[PDB]
Amino acid sequence: MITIKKQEIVKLEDVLHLYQAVGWTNEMLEQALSHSLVIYLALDGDAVVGLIRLVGDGFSSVFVQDLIVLPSYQRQGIGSSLMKEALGNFKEAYQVQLATEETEKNVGFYRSMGFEILSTYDCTGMIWINRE
């Protein structure tokens, strides 16, 4: 049913429906898509139903920047598949990280993928809020 395909060029038109599906806010994104380490798509025949996008230097640091499945699919291992194929390229990267809404669903899913929350190690993510 579902195809996981590595992508070399990803144009925003072909994936904008996925970001809309979550949405939206803010594009930097057109530019971002060219400057990522890797992108995989999830395909239901010809339909684009999921995306993973990794960023970073690819050696010391890799970040799971976008992980999207259409909320209409899901719970059939699409997110897992996307994660396992993309991260397979980076199995020796020094640190691999991500930031998520801290819900039981999100956290339970990333833990099933082998990720742990930073507080378990007395660490924290921080985000730039005040730029002046």
Side-chain angles (χ1 to χ4, degrees), residues 103-115:
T103 71
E104 172 175 54
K105 178 181 196 259
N106 282 354
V107 168
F109 166 77
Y110 291 116
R111 280 192 172 121
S112 77
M113 287 308 102
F115 282 74

Side-chain angles (χ1 to χ4, degrees), residues 71-84:
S72 43
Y73 291 72
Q74 274 184 13
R75 288 181 193 101
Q76 66 186 290
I78 305 180
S80 287
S81 300
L82 285 174
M83 281 287 285
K84 295 170 185 310

